[PDB]
Amino acid sequence: PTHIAICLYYKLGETPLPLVIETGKDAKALQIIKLAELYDIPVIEDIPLARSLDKNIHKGQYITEDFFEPVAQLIRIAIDLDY
């Protein structure tokens, strides 16, 4: 509990892979979580995944192969199907 928040973005025709578009630790993590509620962004607690993303995938970077399926699973849960 160093607090960590990893913000993932995936859009077809833009994003060839899921992108880490923001990250935060400590106070910035808390702010990100507050912004996530304000904008109704799904937030998932997964401590090993969050720690591993934080170490490996920096802001502005695409995810790498070890993360493809764990992140896909989050996307399937979080996607707004728009109806």
Partner: peptide
């Protein structure tokens, strides 16, 4: 100013510890 918020607004999912 606002880039943080605009990135959160458009994002798909947040992973936290």
């Amino acid at each position: 100013s606002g880039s943080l918020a605009n990135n959160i607004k458009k994002s798909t999912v947040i992973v936290k510890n």
